[model samples]
Target: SEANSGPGRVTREQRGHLFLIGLDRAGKRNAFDSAMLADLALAMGEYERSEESRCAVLFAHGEHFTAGLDLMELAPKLAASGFRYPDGGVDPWGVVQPRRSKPLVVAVQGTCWTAGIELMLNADIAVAARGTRFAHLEVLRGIPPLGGSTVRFPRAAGWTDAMRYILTGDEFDADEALRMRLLTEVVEPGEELARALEYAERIARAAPLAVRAALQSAFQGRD
Candidate 1:
């Protein structure tokens, strides 16, 4: 398991914008194996611990945003008798770790389904290209979504709509996703990266501590 225990790679820019790229195999639709998940957990811990980085972004490259988990590889392990995969060490979502003092934004293009959508939901802001498509698809695969979707989706959008997709595994478009409040906005093709950066810049201009406090109060008070 130690071989899987690599570190996450983070790059912080001058404007307090930190980019957290989940590096494993981008060509494999960025499907995060256990090792990469461990690395991401480590990286996120370091990022939040650093006071200089006020906001962070998750950028996934390749043909799709992410093709969910690597079920082909993980299914056999799951089927094995009494097999337990190593713990991720820390939860990427804020609940099980130190709540992020700063905001997080995600840029999504192409097919952002399953866990990918779950990641986007946990972010403070999400920018998607006009061609981006999203789905839960867990139900179709006979797997449960374990990435905080059950709790966040209803709050992010609404119970009715969230259930419509989560239960049926239906794919939704960016325009409809924005209209349903699932996405912040739909940028032109190849524009999600630039738009997300612009949004991060706007947040960076504000008082850092004040922005953190405001985000905390709003998120906590929403319930």
Candidate 2:
């Protein structure tokens, strides 16, 4: 199939011990339809299975990180049977089996909404551009966040902070998001990805077993 054989919706690159996964559909503001979602899942699998890659940085190409799910395309699929990543792919959402054990750092810029926010929430660390705009807009569309937003948001940002935006679907800036504890760092417009990669590089320098043990302990405690 063209989608599988040709250029993918996600790009995978490895530098030393760092695996870089990028969202490539900038034309549509990096929106996720079924194909893009599958590509992301596959890329995630590749990162997880790479023995040489100790840490990963997940970022989107172009100005916008993502405008989020292509509701027009994904809505019907969700109603039909729910979304599922193809075989041999790791579900980035972490809702499915075979959760990733490696460290993941996420970088965001420009417009980020819905699943965009959830992706960061699911990551081990999250970085955003100073002026980035974000919204948990699923509520506005009469759809609750089926991703980690409902479960992780309140825990990550506290009930009041998470509810303020989740319930209202209001647009918030990087500073506000930082205040809400939704972001690890907010760098200048073009620096978010670099900052994220720095974190990945530093994490990669650590002993993999110790890092994984720490993460495993944290995940076990959190869950």
Candidate 3:
């Protein structure tokens, strides 16, 4: 089927890797339905295991980074499919399914709400534009976040701060996010990609094996 055969598209630059998925309406925010999620899972899987790719970024082409799941496309399937969420199991959002064991950096230009916020949470590092608006938004919408936001957000921002946003679903700005340590840095508009690449390059300069081991120890702990 065309849907399975072709979905997400990937682009690479020297040591930098990029995946552009869900590009239909250029101006409107891209929504991550099930198909796009599968595409993203596949792309991330490839990059995480690739020896040549030291670091990668997920970039969305639109006014917003990601508006959340496409209700029009995903809602109907929810009842029949029993609400199968993105990376819903396996502890800590289970976003990578089997887990990446690699460094992932992400960039956000516009609104990073709901699952988009979750995606950024799971990423090792994030760069968000000053104009970006961050929110959990799932609670107010009468839905719980299934993307490991509940687990990763608190772990990233402390239990108190994490609940402030995750439980309340309040919208916050990039500066606040930076202060909370949610984003590595607040970047200038249109410089998200450049900043992300610069950060990724810094990581690329380190010994690959050492970097992998360091990240493994930090994430997996002394187990």
Best prediction by TM-score:
2
Candidate 1 minimal-lDDT segment of 10 residues: 1-10
Q: Tens digit of lDDT per residue, candidate 2, span 32-115?
A: 887888889998998888999999899988888888887677776664556778888998888788889999999999999888
Model 3 residue 94 CA deviation in Å: 3.8
Q: Between which residue pairs do clashes occur in model 1?
A: none
Candidate 3 lDDT: 0.67
Per-residue lDDT of 1-223 in model 1, one digit per residue for the tens?
2112222222334444554543445556666555555556666666666677777776665546666766555555453353232343335555554555677778888887687777788788999989888888777767542443556777767888878888888999898889889788899978887798888778777888899889989877864
Error of 1 at 16 (Å): 4.6
Query: lDDT (CA) for every model shown?
Result: 0.68, 0.85, 0.67
Q: Estimate each model's TM-score.
A: 0.82, 0.92, 0.81
TM-score of 2: 0.92
Poorest stretch of ten by lDDT in candidate 3: 1-10
Candidate order (TM-score): 2, 1, 3
State each candidate's clash count: 0, 0, 0
